[PDB]
Design a protein around this ligand. Structure first.
Ligand code: XMM
Ligand code: XMM
Ligand code: XMM
Ligand code: XMM
Ligand code: CA
Ligand code: CA
Ligand code: CA
Ligand code: CA
Ligand code: MN
Ligand code: MN
Ligand code: MN
Ligand code: MN
Lengths: 238, 238, 238, 238
């Protein structure tokens, strides 16, 4: 069967033939590339941006905010019970693609916290990780497809040359090595927060295709046919 | 000039004359004792209970859950922008009352985290405290009214005897000593999370009146007339 | 080549033939079962104990303390630079054995934090995990030898029957799934802290053999001949 | 009665007068301006530096490292039992002075964590704060002497002009608002960690006088005569 995917997308390229709004946008994706909720994103190609993502099983609202130094922020939210969508054990990761058009999909930092609180207090679990730059040989990441860490310590999700020039038709993903426990039958509340900073540079008039933070089944792998507009996440546009 | 109050109430006594539902309930109170959202609380007098509260400014949803070991939990949420309600600097606290009827309002643990973020993975401001014991001299709490720490290390918000028998017509509150910064001009996202565990015992067959977590202006005090049904928060029932 | 091991041992059985003092002891082991430092441990068989372990690269002192409710604590320290000992990437874990004599090697909770700092604030890493009780399918743990999680949610490092009776000649370990990055060429300061709570029960007049927290090369596995007095860590007593 | 002081000094100006070494140095001060331990400071006037300080009560080792974007590292350590020196409740803070000679004493960030542990994985008391910008009205800091926050959001501990030139004969301190519980009768282990980033700039051939992180009785205030060489911390040079 296909993987089960929940994602927040920073979608730089409007694919209106598969339901994208006709502008760069942020979106919340629940098992489909066709986002349940979107907000218009005013990209600053060449500038370092920041994304903050949060979810709590009591509120049942997955939210995301994108900002840049000295600019107005873009926000997006969706009401959803993640226990009905995802398995109890997941992996978390970042993905990016290029297609006919291209961009650098550079990650400068990534942090993530999750918590599982139950009935009994001494029945609980937490996981936190934080990367400010990345090791050249990162043993706590599963790197998939074209993803790699360059000589500056930056995570490049898609291909770039030695001079830093991006390449088209590229796909890559980075997953945290340990599975994450996001629900159980006795749980009272589960929550997570994620942050990443990113640098999209591009020589193209319309940069493409984007970067996601995603949560999937533990054995998730890049699907066949998921390049370009499908963001390395989905086998089709349904 | 009255305080500005946001609270989560565990209201054990139905004051139907001032808009309570006719059962013990959990509520979200925005500037009034008359809750904007309530849910049925299945009290278990004599068992240790746990409350988890959370908010973030992108989701704009204040939510709370109450539970006991081996039991079903109760949730309540309300969509609100706290920027629009509270001043930028606050104190946070726990309050409790008894009236004609009575209960012990015993706090066994209390923790709190607030974050103010912008454009990096590290937060521009964060505060975290956690008490699992309470000290015989809590120099980091402002104790108001009948609130005191006992010989067992527990925090008693209202009057109780040597023998563990609660008293009627009591009011008590405990505030964390340092002001918390909950928004600013430059802010991208602000969030907070709080947890407390409580023991409510009663000789009566109808215990009263309840316990809250609340957030207020920094100079907040127990208002004249806030006994019983007003939970030590409000000077009247409007 | 053999594994590289740094460990804190709760050594319940004196094997004076390989240099144990003639009493139960807590020990710091650096690449040998023969401890670099020991202290007398006053065991309370059948009671839940707590161990706290810490280290940072400026102080260069690895310390551990073992305690029980109502008792006084025993401490042990050793001055060592852990980088000259350990590789840059490690796994962290828990190990236990039994031999001719036996005990339960039960883990009720385990937490770990590591941090690696430079000065970019944006060149760095942290990892934190916390388990209060353990899942029936612990996908974030690598279980080795006889280790398993039971119906109560406890981690059993060595064999116990369904009635909870321990078995002799057992060895088991549990490793956190993700590698930990503990040094790099640009590092200024690296630190770690670990906590575990444990329950050692035994029908034997002299219980054996003990429990350790350990740090090893990422590919560590139970050496042949590490049963009993070698605590699942070393292939010989050198 | 005088304040009770424990400090880590970054001392830019040798006062051989009162027992400084005859070079710029970092030091550990236990109840006297006359450091119990010093190290020659690998100083870089005009560069952003970072200080990390740590202590735990099992190891009994107070340690500090000062570095500059990864280079030019200096360390200092002292074996000491702080339960014998400090009261159980304290305030923590930063101080700085100029005298005949001068430098900017600029704080760009500051964080602190304190923990008091016993018999579990969850701590019985913890406190954590973090500032990466400082507020125009920082209600959670007690600002003493010349200390103010500037339009950039930096904390200036001593007088600086509107353009950016430091003034002589100035003193300033910033204390965190809430008292900190550092030890108790039945504590198993107490620990704290602090980090700050600073910028010392000077038009002088020989900058003065330095910056400290310190720990004091909760009621601490700038003593009379503690200018220049006494770092705003001590009334005399005894
Ligand atoms: O990278 C931008 C887009 O490039 C391709 O789609 C096209 C967008 N504009 C075009 C113009 C001509 C042709 Br042929 C193609 Cl395939 C496209 C495809 O690779 C899409 O998946 C992708 O989103
Ligand atoms: O503790 C329960 C309640 O007791 C008091 O109200 C009454 C409850 N039963 C009554 C019966 C008669 C009269 Br008069 C009163 Cl005020 C009450 C008041 O103290 C209320 O504020 C409180 O909610
Ligand atoms: O569990 C206690 C000990 O049992 C064995 O060693 C012995 C301890 N007392 C003995 C008495 C007789 C014989 Br045979 C043996 Cl092997 C032992 C061995 O399994 C040791 O590794 C272990 O430490
Ligand atoms: O700012 C650096 C120093 O300047 C002063 O000490 C002197 C250093 N050189 C001098 C030369 C003359 C005189 Br008068 C004085 Cl007080 C000093 C005093 O203000 C000292 O406390 C301070 O350490
Ligand atoms: Ca698209
Ligand atoms: Ca009521
Ligand atoms: Ca032994
Ligand atoms: Ca000096
Ligand atoms: Mn899209
Ligand atoms: Mn009510
Ligand atoms: Mn031993
Ligand atoms: Mn000095």
């Amino acid at each position: 069967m296909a993987d089960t995917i929940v994602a927040v997308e920073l979608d730089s390229y409007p694919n209106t033939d598969i339901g994208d709004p006709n502008y760069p946008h942020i979106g919340i994706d629940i098992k489909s590339i066709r986002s349940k909720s979107t907000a218009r994103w005013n990209m600053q190609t060449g500038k370092v941006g920041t994304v903050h993502i949060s979810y709590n099983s009591v509120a049942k609202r997955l939210s995301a905010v994108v900002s840049y130094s000295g600019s107005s922020s873009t926000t997006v939210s969706y009401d959803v019970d993640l226990n009905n969508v995802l398995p109890e054990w997941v992996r978390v990761g970042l993905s990016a693609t290029t297609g006919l058009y291209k961009e650098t999909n550079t990650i400068l930092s990534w942090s993530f916290t999750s918590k599982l609180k139950t009935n009994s207090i001494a029945d609980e679990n937490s996981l936190h990780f934080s990367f400010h730059k990345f090791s050249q040989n990162p043993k706590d990441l599963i790197l998939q497809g074209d993803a790699f860490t360059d000589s500056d310590g930056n995570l490049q999700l898609t291909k770039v040359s030695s001079s830093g020039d991006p390449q088209g038709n590229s796909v890559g993903r980075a997953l945290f090595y340990a599975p994450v426990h996001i629900w159980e039958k006795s749980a009272v509340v589960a929550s997570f927060d994620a942050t990443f900073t990113f640098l999209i540079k591009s020589p193209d008039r319309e940069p493409a295709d984007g970067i996601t933070f995603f949560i999937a089944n533990t054995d998730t792998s890049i699907p066949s046919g998921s390049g370009g507009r499908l963001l390395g996440l989905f086998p089709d546009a349904n």
